[model samples]
Target chain A: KLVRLPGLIDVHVHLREMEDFASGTAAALAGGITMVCAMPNTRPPIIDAPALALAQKLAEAGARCDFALFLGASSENAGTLGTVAGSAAGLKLYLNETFSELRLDSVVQWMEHFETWPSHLPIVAHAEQQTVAAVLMVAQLTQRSVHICHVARKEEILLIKAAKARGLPVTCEVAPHHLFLSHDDLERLGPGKGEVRPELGSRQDVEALWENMAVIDCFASDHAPHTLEEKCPPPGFPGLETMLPLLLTAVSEGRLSLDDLLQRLHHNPRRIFHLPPQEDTYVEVDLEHEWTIPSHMPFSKAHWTPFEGQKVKGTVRRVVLRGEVAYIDGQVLVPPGYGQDVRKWPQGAVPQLP
Target chain B: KLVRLPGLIDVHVHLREMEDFASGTAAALAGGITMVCAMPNTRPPIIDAPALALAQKLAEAGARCDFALFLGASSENAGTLGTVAGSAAGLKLYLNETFSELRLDSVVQWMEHFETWPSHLPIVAHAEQQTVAAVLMVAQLTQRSVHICHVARKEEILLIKAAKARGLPVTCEVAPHHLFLSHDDLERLGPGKGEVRPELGSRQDVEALWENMAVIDCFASDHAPHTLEEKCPPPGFPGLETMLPLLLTAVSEGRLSLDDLLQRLHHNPRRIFHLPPQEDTYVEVDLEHEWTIPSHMPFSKAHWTPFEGQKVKGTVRRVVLRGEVAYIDGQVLVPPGYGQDVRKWPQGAVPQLP
Candidate 1:
């Protein structure tokens, strides 16, 4: 009935609801997802300590799955990072256009703040070149830990791998869509409305990413859903339901290993985000079963997926989240409002001695 | 607004009924598809001469574009091949599964049938070991024109390429799925049901196919469809919508050239099927336009596609079929009942002097 692996921990997901945190968390539970590190880009953006506190409180009340909120670091919030550090999962610096005004000029100040903080807290980065270069500059100046968000391109992965190999104390995550979709998809599907930053790359780039899957620490969906009309004016495919299946399909193809999948989805993120260890919740895969994606079956409000009718083997028949049956026989059993808020390390708190 | 090119000739499609036909042709128009050569695999399977005529009549009545029908070869209708030669697209031999026991014994007998036929007559063989061997034996015995269907594996393509290089009068077509989806896809998608004959093969096989793209005569969709429930149980993905986009994506990725796409989709198929040349009715593409596929956007009644949410650079803005605008923007313009029957070449008819 179950392969019984550790419950998955996604380090990147967007909880768009300004007040209604329960909706996104409920969606996660229905898919057998356990914990998610929520992004800082929200209705008003979680930039200040007050905003971070509000988000944390909302998650405590509504989250069915465990949640982690990244504190938004803007030019003005450079000093407020410490205020947020206590309750925040990590400090999130956006160098791209989504949210936050943390430009390159603020890098030095932020790096010095990292040095001054007592704990070697992880600095989560939305790594576009401008942001990544700033983060790299900070890493070179200090010995603090860093984690990159959404390793979507081959170059980004290679850069992170090389930096980590050189003892930079850096880690990175990949989104499922990055692994599955490519730049070619953009041409077929149409321009900027259809775009995501760090554009999908060549097939060679995709092949390279799959080849170097060993270094990827986690697989996140970044499951941001917008209405079909919004996405249609400029298209982006939602990936919540398709993520695990796509990865499982990859596992069946021998492009990636089950061990690697387990590590990325469960073990590594649990350690990074400081989630308590739980029993494995592996979904049993027949590896020979084929299935077509059904139309209009997405649990998310967006109600769309990019992987419809893709023939994938190794379907997840059952999933357990923290000893509770979340999904079974292709149906989700987790009722609404059943998730919990995940705790983060307090400011200046170091990992407990082994 | 458009990438000017010659009209495309798709030598494989399935115009089963009004509802089914609309979806098929709608997808075709989206990809700037102008014409198609439909197979005889229908509800009843277009077997006898009367069935062939009926199929042609159905195509003429409701198709939004041009189409041809391949006559199913069965024991009861094996002799009917000669009679329908002038009216039917080609003699579709299913040597592997013997659709209706139309198995022809003795290479000499088959070759004698070919030798007696007209030089321009195309014996379109769906190649399996038995069929390929028989066709080769027949070719070795006498001068007969032949076209191979869906050369899926590397070995098969290599075999055909080698035969062609050695001056054997044989041409082969590779389905877009075979060229793009690999055996790895089968491992992800499942066996037999995900499995098409001549089996999807290694990366080397794909590389070899690309290497010999010039030697290949046509790129066909073989745009098969099945109900979501049936496909979900195992072994299928509706490819009608994905076909042209997949090829265009490949072109944008530099895996193949636009020239190659034009040759395969337009020129090569026309020559192979002996389709009459028509006025310019082609798709225009903007190689830099980024796009994403939406869920449930396929025209196929199956309402599924394998390449959803894929981002590609080139997009088909319009399809001009028979000097009439068939598709423009994201909507189809041609009504349901605009398709016409493709003319068949006469059996034993000599090539008209240019």
Candidate 2:
């Protein structure tokens, strides 16, 4: 018995440590997400081919399912930008100090440089505001497409809405936590519960994000997992484990439909990032099952879950990655090194499962 | 040509300067309020019959509308608390200083004094917390009625809801600021503006107040006044002019209905304070009329309003106080000193208007 759709994908997750690659991907598999595009601002930035190739190797050795690592785009790395663009998911550019920021003085320079890279791939922004505006300009100035990562604010969505109106090639994704949690929730957690790079915004921002979900391209679990040893853990709590189920509850509560969730978590992300179509990959879900995300010892090495004690209607009971069961029966199945590198896949290469 | 229900009343307001008697009530009438329950923490706190009598005389000499002043409760004046209970609306107790505060060290003493006073009139509290618990106990220990003022925070409302469930002789009033605005709005205002005594609460607190508007007995403006010259503005603002129109807008937006507005604004406020019903008093409003609260005006002598340039539905057209046109067409119609002082009115004695 399963509630199946296209295999879910997470386009924005921080794969910070070796355990993050190992434990985080395992958590994703249990959430029924088949693939995730890893953010590249790890302890060692993945700026050149050496770092980019090393990360892909690390992702393969640890990820329980297929994955794509974003190539860290930096101010100093324009020379090797082309050499790395063909290998990773997309160019991850940070305009603010979000774990070693890659800011340029002029967005004009950033836009012009983004055009020099392979046009097929996207320039995914860690845009708090500076990056959001720059990528939209990259679209306008160069007529090249850009993807907005972890759009956390209302103004970001409003600009995306305005950019789309002008027919600019800009696509944006909102995190589930951004839709559900506000700074008010953070206040309840006291000091550290609200820590994340792009701050979880206010009620008005959440209202704006959901109200404009129709215009929003995808829902990425901007899963920035910092251990609760740090304060305000809600913003960094391992979101991959709870993202889809929370979304399912949003559907059950009548805010949206499962189809809308699928479009956001699956279709639009795949389309915007140009990932292969769903194949043998799928996650079986009990859409009516009551799911409680644990507060402690969640699968990720990061351990703490931000949405601890929350109840969601949908539970992922089984997950298959490219026809092989990666997670089922409350256990991760695939070996540590068994996941595929999906960076080079065309469209729908993996056969459909029975 | 106008919208009329019960004569609009503000249960919480500060009439500081003697000229405030002139301008504030005139402003109140133009906003469709025919009466205001004035705060007694004036130049000399209205802690005795002398002060209360003097305020009534001054209001008669200047106020454009009927009024009830809450006698300021101080640790120093529990002896006179009994003297002023009959004339004033309620006992305004402060566990914490609001502007120039009147705090008592012991809740036991406060509650005991509260019961010794008028067995009928209310004990209204403005404490941020320990005072909140103290006054709730005021009803329990004194086994008498108590009214919680502002009811600004969610915990305050939560306790009130629980106390009301247990039938604890507790009634609470939330102000317009607590309902429509939060610290988020104050943040947009920046600096000295956000400095309200019981500060505007979090988004959750605002959500809680609006959601539980069912249990909330009345809506007071908590209209604390401070001159703009004071940087922190003493946690108060000119609220009378904005109260009804904003409430009309709340109804216009479907968060509430006109009946709820009437109950919160007119019926319940009057019921709790035992004010007479409107007879010849009326104010017309266009429900569809978009009213933008002016960005600047210290309508009262205090000279500052928090809600500036904000838009709301419904605009006051004309206001009549006691069959006399007190305010109409933006002008104070009646002579400043002609307003009546019904400080000692028989319950419901004023004839119902046709």
Candidate 3:
């Protein structure tokens, strides 16, 4: 028996390797996360229907948690939104060329498609602008219903809050780094290692986000993994295993409430992405469990975390995905391919502006 | 030949034992600091005339730099204010019971006696009220030339700025921890270890202080040394050796200027405390020297600094105090007991309030 508040739906995740899908999904399940909407900005970019189908097939083969793929938005691939929308989670618009060469001109066309498409598909945006000030202008023009990824800055959070308050159909997500770390962490961790987009704002930014937690729709681990050489060589900390523990510690400190966690980590993302909440699957958390993190204990191939050696409260005791025990006690119980593809635009529902 | 900035003076320092004295004087010399007004809040507490004289004698015997001692404010020695003022640097006030127990009521009569003294010496206060909102109310009644210690909070800094802008005879100092580390550091370093009083304030406080650098009279290392056992066991990361490097790094980073460093660390401390600058002394800094700190290099017995393992751009090459070479490269050239005593209120000019 478990006291479950619906399984968590992580709206942002990155599967770096299709060949290592089992390892990625098992790590997600260990943290009590039930569903993940993976980004399509991969090695060969999942920009078309065929790419989206291939990703779905990979997820079905090994993923322990329900999964969905975001169709990448680029100049060449923008026209295929209709065909890809039939299978993927939503249209992912990369406003800045940090990862791929998807520019704003292509993003505008993609937003137009999301607005007029017969389905109520969300236009998930990695809304990083070359200049931070440009983001405000983009936010002003973008329709309210769009889903923004990684609301890290104070100004960005305020902009989102104002947009949401005006009854605009907007939803936003925050990564673990934004909530638990700041620019000072960069100074301590050093360059490359500490760098993240919409650079960690001042303490006031974190506090302001915590204060306005009600509007934050999801807390997703944009769980991008890299080898130790790739991470520490450029000095970025891999955050897959540390994400849930960091958030749970925040809850233990009264900085966040259990309801707030449920809203951001579970309920909001499921509703925003139209993923059905699985009735028989959930994880129980013992909020008072305190443990010092070990150095080499990560389940990810990238055996590094910014939070190594730090003591964290709130341990996830057990995880059940699709009514089967998937992970328990620092180990995975279920074999690969037990999870199903979470089809986007769940049949027979009109998408309403949130 | 070296560029000298009118001989630097540190408004705060603590020199007790031989080990403490060596570390303290070496740090002062390396930073081009010529004189230091030593606090009487030592383990034995220099509360009386004899104790004050002993501190002066010890500094003369072993200090590499010129020094003066502040007489402790305690009820047992409150009646001997005149005797203390005759030999000490100033009346060291502990508005709140920190390091020693001297309540407001206990020090009231001493304040009245010091008010009528011939030298008109300043009362240096380590005033971190539980609620900083009470500082103005406390300051209004004690209308003396006050030097507030470690102005860390935005509220405290703002109050001091307002008072100074009005031409009041109120000066303030900030330690390296207050200037460089923010509340975010406290959050990361965690309780006890990251803890310091008048808790590290918002980043705006730091930025605002940097903006009003001219008004900030002194930069002193409240260089309170704690062993690693004490620091990591309870309060973490002692900061004595890292002070100069961190501040110098700040100077190189454009957060503060070299002129500002000289003024705050040396010139203003001498002017505020009525101590004379060293007649002939200099420290040379190779601003282009690049080095990454690797943990075991702090001069103090305290095994850790809050800024441990940080990469710094500038390096102190040589330090000459009173025409005697004190520090060269990474070693201390002058042994213990080579320092001079700076007379209290040497010219007997009373500090005038605006």
Candidate 4:
């Protein structure tokens, strides 16, 4: 039996590190995702119009699913970000350290971005620990909407909860690994495989995310990938195709409701990122299909997943994007360049799926 | 005008670290506290009967406030704690590490303590971070009551809140330092002066304690102390003389309600530790008085506070113990030995004030 639902969306993912848009969006569609907002922390990161244009050119030439690019924020381009706000998904600020040029170290820099960025567009922050609190303070001072990315710690989520309670125009997303795995799994995965930014937290931290699900606005994959051979795995897990099955297993175990699944994956992402609706876009899911996630993934060039060998229920059977069948069974039907920028898509009625 | 309320209680403190029972209880009285449960982490730790007897003799000779002691739980004494259960306030398990012999590192050891200790008597644990989750799991497995002490992190208190929501027999207390200070203040206090176990958390963490006040059961001081001259300050601040005033200031600023303060300081401590009533015990406070905390404290040998130099509202004026004026106008009229073990106190009618 099949259940039809609105096409899923992932507000956070990385394609340039190990996978191109061709393979990355294929991986997304295979996982029932019709749209994904790609991060820009690559070498020569996407911080200005030229960088953003290059990323858009690549996606426009090769992406198989609908897509948008986030313009990375750094000290150099705070005043210039508003020019591209209407064309991009949103501004991406790395409040925490990363091995990149995009990480912003001080609140003064955060204030510069918050003050200069357009008020209507949201600012997506890679914030954790005390940094989450700092960004929220900057957002409050400027009265700009902020969306925290990959909230992995208990303190981070509770702080966001309090910020929302006080009506500070803040929203947040949780990565799947944060909700499903913890430090205990690190031993099994080994040191290199276990590394990830905002590292996998304690079991209690995972429990807090599940407990405070009401405060979470989206489910972002943070699908950063690196080859298994990289001796010291640079802090990230390939999560694009594994997120749904893991969430579905949670739903089966009564840890989550089906309505919540749809809200995080579809409604909330669109609401926060302000993407245009895609007419006739939907996914066919085999809700009762049971299988173990394989070590080798279908389309991601990274070639491995941290979720290998995990048994899960539910699998995507088909994906329809913009009134065209993009993926079916185990194959991609749409050619490269078929996927259009969501910002450029014309307004259309989103069909009610039964 | 003065406000009359039940005398405050501090469920956790350490009298032997820098001050004896005489000075510690005097500090307690000056802070409007009439009953204190002292910790067992002394040099010759109070783990067994002989050690407990020695501590009791000291308290009986010098304590100016009604008090009870916690018998430290060691791997050596889990099976033998029952003999002293009726005399002690509760068993204290140092689930987190301390510079003492009582830190229990394994869940098996925690399980043994939870299984063997009497269910009627509470086990107060100095648990922090992931250890808090571990202890809660052990409590669930053993079906024993656990009261967590000095919960300083956002994750710790939120875990306690979730446990209470699920109706597990768990309770918790927050120290004033965890509520009023954060890592930002560490710069001002310098390295040694700012030191504390579960070290002062982020500002977000402090906000979480105030937000989840309903889940907290007591307002403990965890009043461990060491002289300022000690080159490396220990992980504690003298809190017995500051907890009440800090809480009262919070009340004045609308961060707390008078009723919630009374419940945490008086009602909940009595219920959790099973202490007997002390008839006519009350404190009179000048609720409108404002002053800056002095560097030279009235009773504790630790001569300084992390809260020093901060302006605050409210001050304790008088304290009455068991129908006698034990303290009034900054003088402790009650001599050493005037305070007795709360376990040995008699039951009597509790007075109501208008």
Candidate 3 lDDT, B211-283, residue by residue in tens: 6664576887776666555655322234445666677788778676564575576545654665543444666
Overall lDDT per candidate, in order of appearance: 0.64, 0.71, 0.65, 0.81
Model 1 C-alpha lDDT per residue in residues A1-354, reported as the tens digit of each score: 224344567777777732245666655654546777787877668878788778787777767666778777766666546645756677777656543344434556567656644343557777764566567768777755677888776777777766654445567888877788777776755563346656666787777677777568788887776655675643234565677778878876867656567658765675455454333333344455778766534467766565555777655566666567776665667654555555542211223211
Segments in model 2 whose C-alpha atoms lie over 4 Å from true places? A1-354, B98-101, B348-354
Model 3 CA lDDT for position A157: 74
lDDT of 4 by residue, B1-354 (tens): 777767678889999966888888998998999998999899899999899988888898899989898899987888887777767878998877675488676779889988888765678888889989988898888866688888889899888877764546678888999999999999888788888887999999998888887677788888877877872557788888888888888888878667568768876676567554455678888877789999867878888888988788888889998788888867888998888887654221111110
- Model 4 error, position A96 (Å): 1.1
Error of 1 at A251 (Å): 58
Better of 1 and 3 by lDDT: 3
**lDDT of candidate 4 over A262-344, digit per residue (tens):** 66887667656755545668888876778998987888888988888888997888999878998898898998898888876
Q: What's the lDDT for candidate 2? A: 0.71
DockQ of 3: 0.01
Writing each residue's lDDT as its tens digit, candidate 3 over A185-222 gives 76766765555555666788888777777557788887
lDDT of 2 by residue, A30-59 (tens): 777888889887778877788878888888
**DockQ for every prediction shown:** 0.01, 0.01, 0.01, 0.01
- In model 3, which regions exceed 4 Å deviation? A1-5, A100-119, A129-144, A233-237, A344-354, B1-354
Look at candidate 3 and tell me the lDDT of residue A229: 58
Instruction: Give per-residue CA lDDT, model 1, range B1-354, as digits (tens).
Output: 445555567787655633366677777777667777787767678777778777777777767876777776654554445656756666666555544445555454465556644444557777664467567767667655578887776677777766754446577888876677676666655643464555666788777787777567688876666555555543234566667667777876767655456657755565455564444455665555677866555577756555555666666677777667888778889887787765742211213211
